[PDB]
Design a protein around this ligand. Structure first.
Ligand code: 469
Ligand code: BOG
Length: 335
C-alpha cells in the first residue's frame, strides 16, 4: 500500500514526501538541483532527496527526466550513485506531475575531503581503486562518463566514494576539449590520471586558464602527437595545425612526480597518453601492481548492458511522461 505522505514547504515549493523521510533540510545550495538531506527512518540512513524541477515542461525536459531515472535505476554498484527510492505523491498518470529521487548522503565531494593537500600514497591507492572499480562497472554497461572531475565524486568521511552524474575543464581529455565527434571510454581514464596526479602532488596537473592554455599544458607534459597518432586524425584543419607544431619530447614523469611511488608514476604514464587507443582501460588499471592491497578480481562487478537508444527517441511529452511513470511504478528497492 501507498505510504502516508506529508506536505512541507521546502526550497519555495510544496514537497510531499513519504513519512519515512524525516527532517528535510536543503544541501549543496542548488549546485545539485533541488535537494534535501533527510533521515530515512526505514533504513536508518542519511539520504538525499531530489525533487525534479519542471520535469515534463518540454520534450527535452521530459526526455531528460526519463533518462536520469533510467540511468539511476540501472546503476547498482558500491562506487556509483544508484537509487535507494523513487516516488511521486500521485495516485494516477493523470495526477503525475513530480518525481523525487533518493540516494545516499555521502555529504562531501573529493575537494571537500582533500583541500588541495598531498594525500598519502596509501590513501591515493584507496581513492583511485574505487574510481576505477566504479568506472569498470559504468564502462561495461557501455556508458562513457565524459566529465569525471572531483566535484563528480561523492566521498563520505571514511573516504568511501561514489561516482555521480555518469554519462571545471581541467580534468577533460584533449579530444573532449577539442570537440572530436568520436571518443572512447578512456576519455575517463585521462580524467582519473589528472585526479590521481593532483592527489599525489597536492596540485592541479593542468590548470589551463582557458581552452588553448590547457591544451599547451597537456602537450608540454605528453609531447606533441607522434606520426602514428597523426595518421589517426580525420580533420584537415586539425592535421594542418598539428604538423605546424614544433615537435617536442614527452617529459619524464619521474621528474614531474618527484618522490612518488614508482608504481604510481608507472600508472600515471599508462593513463595520460595523448592517443586514446593507447591508454590503460579501467579493468587493466585495477590489475596494475599499484592496487595490490585492494584488488579483488572476484569483487569488481560488471553491469548488464544499457540501452541508450530508448532515451534518444523523439517522442511526445505525454509519451515520455507515461514511460517515466512506468519506471516509477516498476521500481523495486535494493536489498
Ligand atoms: C550524491 C549525493 C546527492 N546529490 C544529489 C542526488 C543525486 C541523485 C539522487 F537520486 C538524489 C540526490 C548531491 C547532493 C550530492 N550528494 C552528496 O552526498 C553530497 C553532499 C554534499 C554537501 C552536503 O551534504 C552539506 O553541505 N551538508 C550540510 C549536509 C556538500 N557538498 C559539497 C556535497 C557534495 C555531495 Cl556529492
Ligand atoms: C593537440 C592535438 C592532440 C589531441 C589528440 C587527441 C587524440 C586522442 O586520441 C584519439 O582519440 C579519438 C577518440 O576521440 C580516436 O578517434 C583516435 O583513434 C585516437 O587516436
Amino acid at each position: 500500500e501507498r505510504p502516508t505522505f506529508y506536505r512541507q514547504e521546502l526550497n519555495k515549493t510544496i514537497w510531499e514526501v513519504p513519512e519515512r523521510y524525516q527532517n528535510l533540510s536543503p544541501v549543496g545550495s542548488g549546485a545539485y538541483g533541488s535537494v534535501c538531506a533527510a533521515f530515512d527512518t526505514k533504513t536508518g540512513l542519511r539520504v538525499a532527496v531530489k525533487k525534479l524541477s519542471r520535469p515534463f515542461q518540454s520534450i527535452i525536459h521530459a526526455k531528460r527526466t526519463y533518462r536520469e531515472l533510467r540511468l539511476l535505476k540501472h546503476m547498482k554498484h558500491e562506487n556509483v550513485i544508484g537509487l535507494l527510492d523513487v516516488f511521486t505523491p500521485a495516485r494516477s498518470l493523470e495526477e503525475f506531475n513530480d518525481v523525487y529521487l533518493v540516494t545516499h548522503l555521502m555529504g562531501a565531494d573529493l575537494n571537500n575531503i582533500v583541500k588541495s593537500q598531498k594525500l598519502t600514497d596509501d590513501h591515493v591507492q584507496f581513492l583511485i581503486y574505487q574510481i576505477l572499480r566504479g568506472l569498470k562497472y559504468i564502462h561495461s554497461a557501455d556508458i562513457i562518463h565524459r566529465d569525471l572531475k572531483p566535484s563528480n565524486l561523492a566521498v563520505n568521511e571514511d573516504s568511501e566514494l561514489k561516482i555521480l552524474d555518469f554519462g571545471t575543464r581541467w580534468y577533460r581529455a584533449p579530444e573532449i576539449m577539442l570537440n572530436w565527434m568520436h571518443y572512447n571510454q578512456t576519455v575517463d581514464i585521462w580524467s582519473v590520471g589528472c585526479i590521481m596526479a593532483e592527489l599525489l602532488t597536492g596540485r592541479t596537473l593542468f590548470p589551463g586558464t582557458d581552452h588553448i592554455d590547457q591544451l599547451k599544458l597537456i602537450l608540454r607534459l605528453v609531447g606533441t602527437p607522434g606520426a602514428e597518432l597523426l595518421k589517426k586524425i580525420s580533420s584537415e584543419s586539425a592535421r594542418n595545425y598539428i604538423q605546424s607544431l614544433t615537435q617536442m619530447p614527452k617529459m619524464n614523469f619521474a621528474n614531474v612526480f618527484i618522490g612518488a611511488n614508482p608504481l604510481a608514476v608507472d600508472l600515471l604514464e599508462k593513463m595520460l597518453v595523448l592517443d586514446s587507443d593507447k591508454r590503460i582501460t579501467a579493468a587493466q588499471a585495477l590489475a596494475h601492481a599499484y592496487f595490490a592491497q585492494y584488488h579483488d578480481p572476484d569483487d569488481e562487478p560488471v553491469a548488464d548492458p544499457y540501452d541508450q537508444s530508448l532515451e534518444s527517441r523523439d517522442l511526445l511529452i505525454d509519451e515520455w511522461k507515461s514511460l517515466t511513470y512506468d519506471e516509477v511504478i516498476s521500481f523495486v528497492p535494493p536489498p
